[PDB]
Subunit: 387 residues, 4 copies
């Protein structure tokens, strides 16, 4: 049975810890893949952590990783939420150096982009098999969300970019049923920049909070209808949520354009809350360290600086990294709304630390009808490793 993820996202006052895998701690001894982007998506029966591996283990010469991000070895794999990315519980998903995954209520759909920078191919899998392909359309690192795509009544939705890391690139929305591409749309966005979208369902539409890597320290926002009509803009709020970013007090916010004089970026997320917004960010303005979630009053629909809530989940003494959204299915929350949840990647090793290698672990959090006390559930491994 296909999920209906037509409900409204749950209004929430805070976020409860769901899971912590401690994979780097464990991989000091265990057989743990060197990973990045430990992203989460859920079927009606369970939530899984997806991740990329270069086929190498923690504490093994292969972890060296002077090896290109976008290598022939990179694969998308998965375990159940909270499990470490260890070899012996891992399900193979796709050959991939860029991915999105999601479940329609019957099977898992995954997309992995691999191949040469100049003409990379995205292969869509459905039920553990290749079902369809998308080649590069602009021949400049075809890439995607690195988080959960979004299925609504059996049709699955995601966003890709193809174009420079910096200047103007091109962006498309893609639609699928049973792993077969049934629609696509180019996103009109001159002057604007979209990458690594963090999306979730809300009211029968798909909303995303993305990364502008060109000039924006505000994050773009998309609202994709089933048809493929969309509105695009920036997250209204008068508080910047990218990294790097300038001061809050030195920023005015905008619903239609990038505002800060920054290049670069980090994947992060945000959740509409009626007219309000919950926005994730690194506590640091410059580094991918510390992690905090703020609720801004009227932050989705206007240039608000009104902070309604703050919750620290990784303190500014500790490394953090990428973050993304997912939702709990109603068939698992048992609610009549979609519980917003997100994960946070906590990166260890190069470049910030002396090690030959680089991996991440995760902390996962869900919505909840209550104010949750500050804490830091940080990675915790003890570096450097044996090697």
């Amino acid at each position: 049975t296909y999920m209906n993820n037509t409900e409204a996202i749950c209004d929430a006052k805070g976020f409860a810890p769901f899971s912590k895998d401690n994979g780097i701690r464990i991989g000091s001894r265990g057989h743990i893949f060197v990973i990045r982007e430990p992203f989460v998506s859920c079927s009606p029966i369970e939530c899984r952590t997806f991740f990329l591996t270069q086929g190498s283990l923690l504490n093994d010469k292969h972890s060296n990783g002077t090896v290109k991000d976008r290598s022939p070895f990179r694969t998308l794999m998965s375990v159940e939420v909270g499990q470490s990315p260890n070899v012996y519980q891992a399900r193979f998903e796709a050959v991939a150096w860029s991915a999105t995954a999601c479940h329609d209520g019957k099977k898992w759909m995954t997309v992995g982009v691999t191949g040469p920078d100049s003409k990379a191919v995205a292969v869509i899998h459905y039920g553990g098999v290749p079902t369809d392909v998308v080649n590069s359309w602009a021949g400049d690192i075809l890439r995607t969300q690195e988080s959960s795509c979004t299925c609504i009544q059996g049709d699955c939705y995601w966003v890709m970019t193809d174009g420079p890391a910096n200047r103007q690139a091109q962006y498309r929305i893609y639609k699928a049923n049973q792993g077969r591409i049934i629609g696509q749309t180019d996103i009109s966005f001159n002057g604007g920049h979209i990458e690594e979208c963090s999306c979730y369902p809300n009211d029968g539409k798909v909303e995303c909070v993305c990364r502008d890597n060109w000039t924006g320290t505000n994050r773009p926002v998309l609202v994709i209808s089933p048809d493929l009509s969309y509105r695009v803009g920036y997250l209204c709020a008068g508080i910047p949520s990218d990294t790097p970013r300038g001061e809050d007090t030195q920023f005015t916010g905008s619903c239609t354009s990038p505002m800060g004089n920054q290049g670069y970026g980090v994947k992060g997320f945000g959740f509409r809350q009626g007219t309000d917004v919950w926005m994730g960010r690194t506590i640091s303005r410059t580094s991918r360290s510390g992690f905090e979630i703020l609720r801004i009053k009227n932050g989705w629909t206007q240039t608000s600086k009104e902070q309604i809530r703050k919750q620290v989940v990784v303190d500014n003494l500790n490394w953090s990294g990428y973050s993304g959204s997912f939702t709990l299915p109603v068939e698992l929350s048992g609610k009549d709304c979609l519980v917003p949840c997100f994960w946070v990647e906590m990166i260890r090793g190069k470049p910030e630390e002396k090690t030959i290698w680089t991996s991440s672990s995760s902390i996962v959090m869900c919505g909840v009808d209550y104010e949750v006390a500050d804490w830091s559930w940080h990675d915790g491994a003890i570096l450097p490793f044996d090697i």
Copy 2:
């Protein structure tokens, strides 16, 4: 289908070995989590061992564990009874430094308490997902059973404390259906102290045998009805079952108040047997070593010293530790009563032994219509380890 655990507990003459995981022996070489509290609970299809991990493995620098009990790394995980707490068979349960788990006949319910000492949050999971929360009510180490909670006709019951390790604290009963809190009750108990309750179903009510950490060397006893009305007191018998404790001959027992001049404690358990009681205890009065189960005649309802049976399960040459109750579902015993069972934790390493680290393994036992011969099924690893 929800379990009916409305039956009477089985009358039993002794206890048969169910399982022994040998996890510390195995983890000399295998990839075995450093654990504590290897507690057992059963669905209608299987019995699982729950445990806490700090995300570290036996024989790995991370086992060091000069690391706070109540750390950001601590998670509740599970394997099938008798399996070691090894990485590759472990199911993630909750982020937690205090837990209870139980199954209602449809899904597993777990509660893990994590967060700061001053305002910790307990997250209830149901079906492998966050479904509800309880924040600290007194801002002093919100904590729970460290054994199996108790489901009766689909509503699940457990006991928490919030307050000093020593002096008067506060204690609540909590009720849930499908992971949603449906009731709660404060337990009136001045002069008395409740922690780490060991509970089981008996006659459509929940009975617990708990730990008084303030002044009692007798263990408290609760009887919780479906409503949340309860009687509370102390286990009547004229024999002390806590550790530390004084001599049997130097104690008179009481159904209503703590009796010995001891602080401190250990989790342990007891089973009503009509008017009789089976009581667990460490053979040592001072140390958590050796383990024995005694049957006292009239021990539940009066100040009896009448020992009906004794069974040694760990000899006084060997380390023991925490212990708790669970019951076998009728759907697995095939009886028309609830088979009482318990587990015993056998702690190795610091402080009793020279090692950088501390873990435990378990022995599990069930009820049975026969007198079972004395033995010691003790942990068995050979310390110190490589390190």
Copy 3:
């Protein structure tokens, strides 16, 4: 659904290799339990290898095993046929230093004997739980088959001994349904000796070929009806099948009494084939090395020396050990008879080899309508190990 294992055993001309686990080879590096008795039994869906472990791994100080056979650590565990006894695929079965397992078509029944030599307890499990117990009846190492018990139309049958390794002991048949003992019988056998029976179903009765450890170099034979009436005797054939044993040419065979002046023994097996018999034995008369199966014409019902077939499965250059029978369910062979199969244990390490430790691997074989060529599928590890 309960199996009907009422059919006749299949007439067979030879035996095809089913499985080889290579667990000692693998455990040079992998995490492989030190095991003994890698015995096989089958449900209607799969065949599993059961084994005992002392909770220690190959290549780990714990493998030392100057440790008593009959220790507190010894547990019965299982994997799917052909898998190594590795930690991460192992299902826990029972606490045990002596076992039998079998499936009735609905659940697995296991029996593990543990406890003190003087009053050991056998715990019967059903569906992964304690369901019943048998204490020592003669207070001298209560013990059992170390191979597959036998279920016929939902009632399960096995044989135990209690008494000296040497002189007269006592022997019982035990009957069970859903893990509850429903019948028992003492076996009248003065002058005779029964241990380690290898049994299988044939024509709605249970037949076993056992080990006489007192004076017999012929193996005893039992035929147990559903009631518990039985005939007992020795395997008629004029060829000795125990180890140690004298020459074939120096033996006359007997259907009613032990014949050779040998103490000691080895578990082995035999299959009725109408009036014929297939008999297993070590190629060596003195050592547990080499393994061969012979078909004797009229060997079940008379003192025959007529060898109809011989098949070597381990050559006399290689260590062998225990062996036992099982049958393929009709629901898996797809035949209208019960395919006879057996396994052979191949023991490495002490005492025959310089190592601190002792383990075994297995080769498994099934019936088949054809003459199978001689070979040696022997253990294969390269000793001594790192240590």
Copy 4:
């Protein structure tokens, strides 16, 4: 339910990466079997990689493998596509130094050939059990496909050879239902040579593209009808696809006979595409290195040199090896034709590299309605290993 694999093979313009296991990279640290022939076959629910192991692990003295190819230790095992051949996810299949596997829509059928060169036995398994046998018919290394056999409406088909590696040998087709041999056929082919067939279903018949090890640098082709009538010949195209082979420009092709003056060979594959053909080959004419797939116009039915497409999947800087065909079931592609896919083995170690040992990893590819960009998804481990 039995599969209908009666459909036409899908017409395809290129091949998308399905899976990459990185098992040699991983086995630098993980517990990875030393393998060969990582072949793929699919049930209606999943695709599995089959492989042979000698029971030894990467990085362990046992990997030495001065050990005969055709040893007593060699077993056929399997994992899910894309998983490494690691110990803890492996399903045991057969005792085997030569194999074929396939699923009929209800159970897995496997065949493993083991035993002495002079009289080897092939045991057919069905549902994880021995169901039937084939002994050597010519007493010269009875052997088979080393890739997916082929089930059509519940009857399963495969090809074996028995005879010299070089001169004339003998070749048979074998047919089975539920693991029982229901038909066989000798293949008339004087002057010709068949080994290691790569087969797939097309139009209710079985087509194979095989290895001539005697004199042919073209690959033989068989078309087996349900009856067991067949046409046999050589792949028509005017381009040689074996290794070793001469230049393309120095070859004329033939539909009926071997053409090049080469002995030796490599397993490879080809797919009919109406009248066209997709042909696999090593980029090297002399070495098993690099891998490319070419589409020849009219290549199946005539002596064409017309190259319609080329796709590189392993570049000529990298080791490659064996290759085979499988098809995606309609129940997983969701198409009304059979998606052609193939795998490529990438061999590391001896003899090409300085190591004591030899293993392989794989890349898997499927059909697809699009031109796929050149790349090299090559093995990637860093040799030599610790040892």
